[model samples]
Target chain A: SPVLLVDTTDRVRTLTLNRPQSRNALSAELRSTFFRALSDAQNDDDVDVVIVTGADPVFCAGLDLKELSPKWPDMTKPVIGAINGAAVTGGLELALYCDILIASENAKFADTHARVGLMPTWGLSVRLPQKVGVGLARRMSLTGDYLSAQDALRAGLVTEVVAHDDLLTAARRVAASIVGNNQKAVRALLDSYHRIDALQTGGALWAEAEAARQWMRST
Target chain B: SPVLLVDTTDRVRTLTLNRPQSRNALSAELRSTFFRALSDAQNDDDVDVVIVTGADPVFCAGLDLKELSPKWPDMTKPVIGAINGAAVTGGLELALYCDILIASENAKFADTHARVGLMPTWGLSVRLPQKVGVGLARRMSLTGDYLSAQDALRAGLVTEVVAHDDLLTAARRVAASIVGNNQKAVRALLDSYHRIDALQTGGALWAEAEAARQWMRST
Candidate 1:
């Protein structure tokens, strides 16, 4: 089976990360495929909303570190994670990129880059803080601590938590709701939100990117 | 006293709806004065953040039905209601404009314009659902139901809630936290967030305005 599982119902598309063995660790190829699929869904006139989920027990454990430990891969598109279990290190990064998140009660989240003598190269430094408040975001990244599903919900890192058995169904419900909206309005709404973010945070993004670059060189 | 009470401290400006006797009702003079204060606060270098709160007891009851019973008013600047007690009709519209909200446990909110044989003129239609999800917004507006502090918190209308005694202190603490940060960065951050909203919902804004205009003429 393909590393990325693509399923569409009504106007919603579900992108399931398929490699449960590697904890759905995102391989470079997987990121490429995932981005391609997401773009395709966006381009498709019938697809109004997309659900990113994991197959079986795990949602995504994040980047396949063993493979990418030798070289870092770049990410461009946003992908939400329907976290079913624990997401650590790079797995957390992938989840952060998602527009919205839904996690099962059993799910846990951690960013362990500091523990492994590496740091986040992706947008975590910016996006995480934006999703959750800066104080909460700082504590999470600085400690590299694990967070329970309930805690994630409280922090606004994830929108809602469903029972482990009902995870995918919950995600589909969200997708269906989004799909039921006027398609033109939904797209316009999404576009306006992003545009506003860019207009407001454009400077911050530059500052963060430059800071990250300097930190990478010095550290 | 001025219809709008503006106070700046710790890089956070608390814009208080001062006419507690009328439950801080939205009057033509109050609306005009409040908007001017808010616009000034937004551009003020001394204010790093803004928190909209009421004097004490009640946050606001609604448009001073007395004022709007005869005519309507136009307001340009955005003001947020901290919702210390009850926010109804026009009062809720003020709260909806705020980028963030921190309500007291005693706070209650309702948008009952339709039930009163009237309709909202301010941007409540667009603002309500953007802060809270569409499901909750629809439920609130359709039924004209009162939302308790807990209900509002669950619906994402209020970011935080505390005891009545601790309301201002809690809000001040939040403001102080923002003040402690790099001033430029905080402004940039808020600007970016607002930009994102504009990008995503610019179309909604237009639609909402158009609808309100039509509502105005028919009513």
Candidate 2:
């Protein structure tokens, strides 16, 4: 089976991380497939919104340590993350890339970059603070603690939490709502959002990533 | 009544938007007074934190439509919004400007710039999306819908919500907590947050404002 699966219904495209056996770890192939799918979805005229989820049980265990570095993609359409289970370390970074997150009752989020003696390069340090505020972000990154779905909802990390069985349904509903809007206005607003978030954190994000690189080398 | 009132207690300066009859509308004089007071608070060594709230019943109705444009102030001190009632349009902008927002149960937040046929120049367009994700931000701004305090908390718009009567107390407590932190570290963190947010959204914000100006002139 492919590392990633793509399906579309009613203008909403769903991308499932298809490696449940490895807890959907982000191997080289999976990362490549994910980025390719994202590019295709962005170019697809029928796709108004995109939803990303894992197969089941575990959303993502993060990067496969054996794999090389990843090249992130530039996304145009709004992406909704249907978090079905654990999104840890690099997995958490991937989830943060989404425009919105809908979590299943079984979902959990954590940042273990510190525990692994690694620094985040995917805007996790910057975006996490923006999403959940500085204090909670600090706690999560420093301690490598798992934030339960309910706790994540309270921290404003995810938009909504649903029963594990209903995760896709909820995400699809939100995507349909996005599809119902004026496409031009929706895209423009989304552009503004992405631009602003990057502007607000880009420098700090770069600095943090650079420092992380230096720290990893010295250690 | 004075359009704005200021008081200080235990290193926490409270600025109350005092025009209750007008729902604390931002008239020209009121805007000037607000900026001056903020400047004063920023310069005062005794003021470690600031709390902004309305006198009672209402927080702010936004810019008075009959009035001219508003000139927002630059703030150095960490500002905590003690939202008591409605924060709509420019009022919502004011609340978003604060470093932290503690909402009262009666507080309802909405962005009415689209409905009013005016563009937000006070960082609302940029900041709102950062506070809440793009999806919720778009929905609120495009629809001009009122988000109740509970819903606002759910969306991560406000930091915390307390009973209406406990609003000021809660804000004060939080301010005191800030005061307890290492002052230099607190200020540095605040500065970092502001700088990163600006970097992420500044260009987009400027473009949007310029476009709004052009649209207004052409119409």
Candidate 3:
């Protein structure tokens, strides 16, 4: 099977990360493919909404630790994360990037960046705090704790949590809802959300990145 | 009773909105007194935390709709919102302004700016979506719907929801936790949160305000 699968139905595109052997650990090939797929989906007029999910049990286990560098694509279309299992570190970052997240009962989220001796460059530190409160975000980051699906729902990190079998169905339903909206208005509102989200977290993101850079260089 | 009541104990300052007769509406005098009290609390070295609430039954109804203008003071201290009842429109905005929000079982929040034919100048349009996801925020703003305390807690709008009678106790307990932290670190974290928040919402807020001005002018 391909590293990433793209299937479209009813103007909704489903992108499946398919490396269940390693919990969909983001390899360079998978990451590149994922970005390309996202870019194509954004440009496709037939695509009104995008649903992201894992092939089977695991959503993602983070960037393949052995992978040298990780890159995420620019997203214009609304992405709904259908998290089926654990989303850790870079995987967690990917989930956060989505406009909405629908998690399965089996799903769990954690940030292992601190444990891995790496600082987040992909808005995790900023966005996490915005999603969950600052105190909880700090607790999770500092302790490398795994937040369960129910807790994620409670923390507003995910839109909802469903039974494992219902994850994809729920995600697709949300996608259809987005597809049903006035496309122009929906897109404009999404742009506004992204713009406002950037304004709210951009400064701290930059500062954190710069600080991380300095720390890396000194070491 | 005074329109505003100020009480301080154990390094926590409590400001009670005392306009039960009018649901603690932000009339000119009440607004003025609130700002003055907030300013004084922020300036006091003895104060580590500030809690804002209403006398009973109602937290705040919002701006006295007939009132011409509204003003909120700059806040350097952490403001914990102890929402006891309805917090609508401008009252909701005031709650959003706080660093933390704790609500009673009876608390209900709504954004009535659209229904009232008013554009929010107090950062509601941007901040609302930040607290609640854009989907829910849009729904609430467009429909002027009320969000109950449980829903508000689920949406991440309020940190906690306690029994009506225990609202103040819960708020004060949280305030005590804040007061127990190193003042410098707490203030720095709060400042960082604000700075990051501004980065996320500043541009859209400005654009929304300008558009609202033009909208009001044309009508």
Give DockQ for candidates 1 onward, in order. Answer: 0.08, 0.18, 0.12
Question: What interface RMSD does each of the candidate structures achieve?
Answer: 8.5, 4.1, 5.4
lDDT tens per residue, model 3, B1-219: 899999999999999999898889999899889999988998999898999999889899888866662366666679999999999988998998888899999999987765556667777777788777664575455446688999898887899999999999999899898888889989888888878877766687886676457546755
lDDT by residue (A88-128, candidate 2, tens digit) is 99899898888788899999999999898888888788878
Name the DockQ score for candidate 3.
Answer: 0.12
What is the lDDT for B4 in model 2?
A: 92
TM-score of each: 0.59, 0.69, 0.63
* Of 1 and 2, the candidate ranking higher by lDDT: 2
lDDT per residue, candidate 1, B25-46, as tens digits?
8788887787677677766666
Summarize candidate 1's per-residue lDDT along A54-116 as a digit string, tens digits. Answer: 776766766788896112122212234678888776677667656667889988888777677
- Badly placed stretches (over 4 Å) of model 1 are A69-80, A215-219, B1-93, B98-151, B154-156, B159-219
Scored by lDDT, the top model is 2
Question: Backbone collision count in every prediction?
Answer: 16, 11, 9
Q: What share of the true interface contacts does each candidate keep?
A: 0.00, 0.15, 0.11
Better of 1 and 2 by DockQ: 2
Candidate 2 TM-score to native: 0.69
lDDT of 3 by residue, A156-213 (tens): 7886789998888887776765665556545544555566666667688888788779
